[PDB]
RNA sequence: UUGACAUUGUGAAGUACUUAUUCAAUGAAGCGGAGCUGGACCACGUUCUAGCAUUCAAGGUCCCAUUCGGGGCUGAUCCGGGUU
RNA sequence: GCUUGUGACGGCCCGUGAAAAUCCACAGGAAGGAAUAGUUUUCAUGCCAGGUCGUACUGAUAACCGCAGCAGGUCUCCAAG
RNA sequence: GAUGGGGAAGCUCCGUUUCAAAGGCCUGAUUUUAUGCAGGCCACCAUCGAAAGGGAAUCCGGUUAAGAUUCCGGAACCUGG
């Protein structure tokens, strides 16, 4: 039945003032301010979420290694595999049609 | 000869980006330049 | 079991606004909420977003159309007129 | 008396347009060398809703002729235009829905929309949903073109003016009754502050020329001449006739 | 009527080599103990040579004409066949099933393929094979 | 804040030139279903991280304590 | 009548329905004729033609969508492309169809 | 709102011009005239496909004084400097 | 079960429901580069620094405004059986 | 809400990219000294405007008559170099 308070000066329930209730090693309940959840990067062509890419706030990508931000393929962290497949098939067939 | 190849560019409408050409006829000159030229005319 | 005799989708308005006005809204409400065939993939997966915007659930393709139907009668006539005049300038 | 309602709107304080959610001004491309001599191909990226506008808008991407990049154009979408469609604009464009052509390069009876009044003003006529322009004549010697406007008027336009083949999408919108005051409220919430409207006969004489009296009535003819001054032009201005 | 032969040139569609041109060396139509599907043993290009003009000196031309090859077992569904052909008798013996599943034998095959590709690029022939696909 | 489960890397940390202090903690915990055993933890204070090695066998614990470098400040309990 | 000719090969010949199975038959050289629905996307349509050109296979373009091609074959589902492995008691392969 | 005068010039006959003035657009890019090539006065690199298009441009040719490169013409016809 | 967060969905519009700073990926291939030698500080570890102003307390039937220690007025979070 | 400009006898008014010659970061060239000189890049063209919008990074225990996510102990993290 322990009640909690905000730990900052903002007294309103905005998107940047969300809290979670946790229990401390001291045995009491205390509010825990939580950052807004991240959004997965999306494919450039179809707009679907990219597989194999970490989900973080924009500034946090500068701290992680490059292996978390790309895929070992052309357009790795930009376009998904299916859209890359469509690009290659279209490129080959159109250029062949140009010759004929 | 066995490595170099000839790849002419197409500069027609809708084709490759246009090359750099002399645009002295279309230069937006300063105001004082235009006045002294238009005074002559 | 049949729930309403004639109001259909306009039963949400109760007894308000007049029977004639509710009848007019009923005809257009059914069309804008209907499901339409897609001309690109052949499936019955085309529904309306905002007015004049029609998007297929499959094949992720959007077509500009009428306010409450995919294709208006006036637009169908225009396609025939453009087609007839197009063949008179190339052949 | 005091300044009447229609006079106060010119100051533009609370009567300005609400343009926060607008996608952008809908215009054709700038008339350039490719447009006036050949054609240039563009690709429709998406068709999106625009706040305060019944007709949908189309986002079309063209390539820049003079430097390596892409250029974004906002068009008013015609019926039948779809995402992924190629759009051809220029003097030598084909006669297909969505293509932009000069009015002098299309046959008689062609249906067009977003028509330029003068070459290069980027579309002035037939922009609302379901509206179009009919081309009804050519004057090759005078380089003029006769067209019919949505209001029924006949206008003579230069043959170099451009237009888009087809009819503006979203037609039939006004056939559905609003059915309640709430939907009228949300319609004008994204246009401007012109709703609701108070009748002049319900006001006092200080407020409106129709105000006052022990009965609610106008008291003089509501047909007002063209030569009247501000504060007097309330009612039917320069009416040629009245009645049903 | 069958085009999946030992000289057909194909384009890889998936797998870190998507968009890279390749030539079939040994096809296996009716699967195997591993890879229970139609597959081919192929050798391709991982780093295409750069464009060379007459202004480049002898020192820079050699650096720009280097080719980085690779060997891979690829499913038929992940290949896009073409109409071009390329002779494989110069390195057919080194690219095989025994070459794979062994780290030492993989590199020995690749350096053999590298020599054949570079000599093919010199005295220009199969120019389409050595031209990087743009996509 | 970091745990290591290899003795070989533990001795490398004790001579990293930035380590000056260490502590030994003895815990009396119960195993799954047997008699109580003494558990010892070796904690190395690095510049950025604290490394903890935990071993449950007292026989090997005694050897590791002796093998610690003589120039390292070791805190018992 | 293509519909009647296509019906006869169903009950006496060996056919193949669907894009993936048609491509597999083309690679193996067992295909003799492919029928493509009108509303097939051009990119897929051009890919099938390129495979057919390599395998020397005749191509026929059906005058209907995938709904209509499925009905002609005699199925209750849509078919985008039909591959003919061997004709039965029909002469579809030697005529305009 | 209507007339007069000023802004306010140029040519013809019983409307014509341009330079003043006015309107509009473009980070003033292709205007006007001529000349090639083709066709029958017109054209003179782009239309199955949601790919791609950028490093004074490759090539050809003429110079440097050989070194890792640089400089002209052509590629991309001339003429008039009236941005349209 | 209560409060709250979140996921995949569904209904609604002539209403389709901000901007910018800032961070990252890819396309591209200008340059830079090895054999008695170089390059990566997007792998690990190690070194230094992080200024200025606000921070007490009331937040109301007594700390704010209504001439006042005035039954009025004044935005919001936590919520036991 | 300045500047460039146009109004107004004038206090001042209009307008915010506008009929403007509107500005500076990668380095090459120099070992006279510090930046003159050479290709290119970019033309976006003041500034103000949120202690509830956007936003790099901290937690637990203890401590005062009155201070703390700010002090003490321990354990972390970010940015710039
Ligand atoms: Cl009023
Ligand atoms: Mg905030
Ligand atoms: Mg009253
Ligand atoms: Mg009055
Ligand atoms: Mg009156
Ligand atoms: Mg306090
Ligand atoms: Mg007071
Ligand atoms: Mg007071
Ligand atoms: Mg001002
Ligand atoms: Mg500010
Ligand atoms: Mg306190
Ligand atoms: Zn995708
Ligand atoms: Zn569809």
Swiss-Prot record, chain A:
What biological process terms from GO does the record include?
cytoplasmic translation; ribosome biogenesis
Keywords for the protein's UniProt record, in alphabetical order: Cytoplasm, Ribonucleoprotein, Ribosomal protein
Q: GO cellular component annotations, sorted alphabetically? A: cytosol; cytosolic large ribosomal subunit; preribosome, large subunit precursor
Record keywords: Cytoplasm included? yes
Instruction: Establish whether keyword Ribonucleoprotein is in the entry.
Output: yes
Instruction: Determine the domain of life of the protein's source.
Output: Eukaryota
First-listed, main subcellular location of the protein, grouped into a coarse class:
cytoplasm
Compartmental location? Cytoplasm
Cysteines joined through disulfide linkages: none
Name a GO molecular-function annotation. Answer: structural constituent of ribosome
Its assembly, as annotated, is: Component of the large ribosomal subunit (LSU). Mature yeast ribosomes consist of a small (40S) and a large (60S) subunit. The 40S small subunit contains 1 molecule of ribosomal RNA (18S rRNA) and 33 different proteins (encoded by 57 genes). The large 60S subunit contains 3 rRNA molecules (25S, 5.8S and 5S rRNA) and 46 different proteins (encoded by 81 genes).
Other facts: Present with 23600 molecules/cell in log phase SD medium.
| Function per UniProt | Component of the ribosome, a large ribonucleoprotein complex responsible for the synthesis of proteins in the cell. The small ribosomal subunit (SSU) binds messenger RNAs (mRNAs) and translates the encoded message by selecting cognate aminoacyl-transfer RNA (tRNA) molecules. The large subunit (LSU) contains the ribosomal catalytic site termed the peptidyl transferase center (PTC), which catalyzes the formation of peptide bonds, thereby polymerizing the amino acids delivered by tRNAs into a polypeptide chain.
**Family, as annotated:** Belongs to the eukaryotic ribosomal protein eL34 family.
Curated annotation (Swiss-Prot), chain B:
From the Swiss-Prot or TrEMBL record, state where the protein is found: Cytoplasm
- Please state which protein family the record places this protein in: Belongs to the eukaryotic ribosomal protein eL8 family.
Subunit composition and interactions: Component of the large ribosomal subunit (LSU). Mature yeast ribosomes consist of a small (40S) and a large (60S) subunit. The 40S small subunit contains 1 molecule of ribosomal RNA (18S rRNA) and 33 different proteins (encoded by 57 genes). The large 60S subunit contains 3 rRNA molecules (25S, 5.8S and 5S rRNA) and 46 different proteins (encoded by 81 genes).
Give the function comment from the record: Component of the ribosome, a large ribonucleoprotein complex responsible for the synthesis of proteins in the cell. The small ribosomal subunit (SSU) binds messenger RNAs (mRNAs) and translates the encoded message by selecting cognate aminoacyl-transfer RNA (tRNA) molecules. The large subunit (LSU) contains the ribosomal catalytic site termed the peptidyl transferase center (PTC), which catalyzes the formation of peptide bonds, thereby polymerizing the amino acids delivered by tRNAs into a polypeptide chain.
The miscellaneous comment for this protein is: Present with 238000 molecules/cell in log phase SD medium. There are 2 genes for eL8 in yeast.
What protein name applies here?
A: Large ribosomal subunit protein eL8A
* Organism, as annotated: Saccharomyces cerevisiae (strain ATCC 204508 / S288c) (Baker's yeast)
Q: Please specify the portion of the entire protein covered by the chain, as first and last position out of its full length.
A: 24 to 64 of 256
UniProtKB/Swiss-Prot annotation, chain D:
Q: Does the keyword rRNA-binding apply?
A: yes
Q: Where in the cell is it found?
A: Cytoplasm
Where is it chiefly localized? cytoplasm
Which keywords belong to this entry?
Cytoplasm, Isopeptide bond, Phosphoprotein, Ribonucleoprotein, Ribosomal protein, RNA-binding, rRNA-binding, Ubl conjugation
An example GO biological process term is: cytoplasmic translation
Q: One GO CC annotation, please?
A: cytosol
Q: Report the InterPro entries cross-referenced here.
A: NA-bd_OB-fold, Rib_uL2_dom2, Ribosomal_uL2, Ribosomal_uL2_C, Ribosomal_uL2_CS, Ribosomal_uL2_dom3, Ribosomal_uL2_RNA-bd_dom, Translation_prot_SH3-like_sf
State the superkingdom: Eukaryota
**Record-listed Phosphoserine modification sites:** 51, 94, 158-159
Say which family it is in.
Belongs to the universal ribosomal protein uL2 family.
The remark listed among the other comments is: There are 2 genes for uL2 in yeast.
Question: What does this protein's UniProt record list under function?
Answer: Component of the ribosome, a large ribonucleoprotein complex responsible for the synthesis of proteins in the cell. The small ribosomal subunit (SSU) binds messenger RNAs (mRNAs) and translates the encoded message by selecting cognate aminoacyl-transfer RNA (tRNA) molecules. The large subunit (LSU) contains the ribosomal catalytic site termed the peptidyl transferase center (PTC), which catalyzes the formation of peptide bonds, thereby polymerizing the amino acids delivered by tRNAs into a polypeptide chain.
Name listed for the protein in its UniProt record: Large ribosomal subunit protein uL2A
UniProtKB/Swiss-Prot annotation, chain E:
Chief location: cytoplasm
Q: Name one GO cellular component term.
A: cytosol
A single Gene Ontology MF term assigned here is: structural constituent of ribosome
- What sections of the protein cross the membrane? none
Q: Fetch the Gene3D superfamilies from UniProt.
A: 2.30.30.770
> InterPro entries, from UniProt?
Ribosomal_eL27, Ribosomal_eL27_CS, Ribosomal_eL27_KOW, Ribosomal_eL27_sf, Translation_prot_SH3-like_sf
Q: What GO biological process term is on the record, naming one?
A: cytoplasmic translation
Protein family according to the UniProt entry: Belongs to the eukaryotic ribosomal protein eL27 family.
Q: How does it assemble?
A: Component of the large ribosomal subunit (LSU). Mature yeast ribosomes consist of a small (40S) and a large (60S) subunit. The 40S small subunit contains 1 molecule of ribosomal RNA (18S rRNA) and 33 different proteins (encoded by 57 genes). The large 60S subunit contains 3 rRNA molecules (25S, 5.8S and 5S rRNA) and 46 different proteins (encoded by 81 genes).
Q: What does this protein do?
A: Component of the ribosome, a large ribonucleoprotein complex responsible for the synthesis of proteins in the cell. The small ribosomal subunit (SSU) binds messenger RNAs (mRNAs) and translates the encoded message by selecting cognate aminoacyl-transfer RNA (tRNA) molecules. The large subunit (LSU) contains the ribosomal catalytic site termed the peptidyl transferase center (PTC), which catalyzes the formation of peptide bonds, thereby polymerizing the amino acids delivered by tRNAs into a polypeptide chain.
Q: Further remark, if any?
A: Present with 7380 molecules/cell in log phase SD medium. There are 2 genes for eL27 in yeast.
């Amino acid at each position: 039945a322990q009640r909690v308070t905000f730990r900052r000066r903002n007294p309103y329930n905005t998107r940047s003032n969300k809290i979670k209730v946790v229990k401390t090693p001291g045995g009491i309940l205390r509010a825990q301010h939580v950052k807004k959840l991240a959004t997965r990067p999306k494919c450039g062509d179809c707009g679907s979420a990219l597989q194999g890419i970490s989900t973080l706030r924009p500034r946090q990508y500068a701290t992680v290694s490059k292996t978390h931000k790309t895929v070992s393929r052309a357009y790795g962290g930009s376009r998904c595999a299916n859209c890359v497949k469509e690009r290659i098939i279209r490129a080959f067939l159109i250029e062949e049609q140009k010759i004929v | 000869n066995p490595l170099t190849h000839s790849t002419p560019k197409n500069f027609g409408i809708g084709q490759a980006v246009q090359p750099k050409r002399n645009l002295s006829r279309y230069v937006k000159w300063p105001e004082y330049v235009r006045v002294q030229r238009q005074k002559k005319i | 079991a049949k729930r309403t005799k004639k109001v259909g989708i306009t039963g949400k308005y109760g007894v308000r606004y007049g029977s004639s006005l509710r009848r007019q809204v009923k005809k257009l409400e059914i069309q804008q909420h209907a499901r339409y065939d897609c001309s690109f993939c052949g499936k019955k997966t085309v529904k309306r977003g905002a007015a004049g915007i029609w998007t297929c659930s499959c094949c992720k393709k959007t077509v500009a159309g009428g306010a409450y139907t995919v294709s208006t009668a006036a637009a169908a006539t225009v396609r025939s007129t453009i087609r007839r005049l197009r063949e008179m300038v190339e052949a | 008396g005091r300044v009447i309602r229609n006079q106060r709107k010119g100051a533009g304080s609370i009567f300005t347009s609400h343009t926060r959610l607008r996608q952008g001004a809908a215009k054709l491309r700038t008339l350039d060398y490719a447009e006036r001599h050949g054609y240039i191909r563009g690709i429709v990226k998406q068709i999106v809703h625009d706040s305060g506008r019944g007709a949908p808008l189309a986002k079309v991407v063209f390539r820049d002729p003079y430097k390596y990049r892409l250029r974004e154009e906002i068009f008013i979408a015609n019926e039948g235009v779809h995402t992924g469609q190629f759009i051809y604009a220029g003097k030598k464009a084909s006669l297909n829905v969505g293509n932009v052509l000069p009015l002098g390069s299309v046959p008689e009876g062609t249906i067009v929309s977003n028509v330029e009044e003068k070459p290069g003003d980027r579309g002035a006529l037939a922009r609302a949903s379901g509206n179009y322009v009919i081309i009804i004549g050519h004057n090759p010697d005078e380089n003029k073109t006769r067209v019919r406007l949505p209001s029924g008027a006949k206008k003579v336009i230069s043959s170099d003016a451009r237009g888009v083949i087809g009819v503006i999408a979203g037609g039939g919108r006004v056939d559905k009754p609003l059915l309640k005051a709430g939907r009228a409220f949300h319609k004008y919430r994204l246009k401007r502050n012109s709703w609701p409207k108070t009748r002049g006969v319900a006001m006092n004489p200080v407020d409106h020329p129709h105000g006052g009296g022990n009965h609610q009535h106008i008291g003089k003819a509501s047909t007002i001449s063209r030569g009247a001054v501000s504060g007097q032009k309330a009612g039917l201005i320069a009416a040629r006739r009245t009645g049903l | 009527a069958k085009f999946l032969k030992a000289g057909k040139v194909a384009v890889v569609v998936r797998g870190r080599y998507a968009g890279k041109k390749v030539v079939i060396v040994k096809p296996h139509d009716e699967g195997s103990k591993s890879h229970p599907f139609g597959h081919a043993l192929v050798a391709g290009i991982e780093r295409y040579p750069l464009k060379v003009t007459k202004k480049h000196g002898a020192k820079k031309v050699a650096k720009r004409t280097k080719i980085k090859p690779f060997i891979k077992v690829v499913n038929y569904n992940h290949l896009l066949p073409t109409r071009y052909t390329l002779d494989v008798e110069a390195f057919k013996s080194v690219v095989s099933t025994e070459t794979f599943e062994q780290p030492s034998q993989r590199e020995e095959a690749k350096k053999v393929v590298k020599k054949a590709f570079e000599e093919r690029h010199q005295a220009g022939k199969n120019q389409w094979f050595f031209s990087k696909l743009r996509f | 804040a970091r745990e290591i489960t290899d003795i070989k890397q533990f001795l490398e940390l004790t001579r990293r030139a930035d380590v000056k202090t260490a502590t030994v903690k003895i815990n009396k915990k119960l195993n799954k279903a047997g008699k109580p055993f003494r558990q010892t933890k070796f904690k190395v204070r690095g510049s950025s991280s604290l490394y903890t090695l935990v071993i449950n066998d007292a026989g090997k614990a005694k050897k590791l304590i002796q093998s610690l470098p003589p120039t390292l400040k070791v805190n018992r309990l | 009548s293509i519909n009647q000719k296509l019906a006869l090969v169903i009950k006496s010949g060996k056919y193949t329905l669907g894009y993936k199975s048609t491509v597999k038959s083309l690679r193996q050289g067992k295909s003799k004729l492919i029928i493509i629905a009108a509303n097939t996307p051009v990119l897929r349509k051009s890919e099938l033609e390129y495979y057919a050109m390599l395998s020397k296979t005749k191509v026929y373009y059906f005058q209907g969508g995938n709904n209509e091609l499925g009905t002609a074959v005699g199925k209750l589902f849509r078919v985008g492309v039909v591959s003919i492995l061997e004709a039965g008691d029909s002469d579809i392969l030697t005529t305009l169809a």
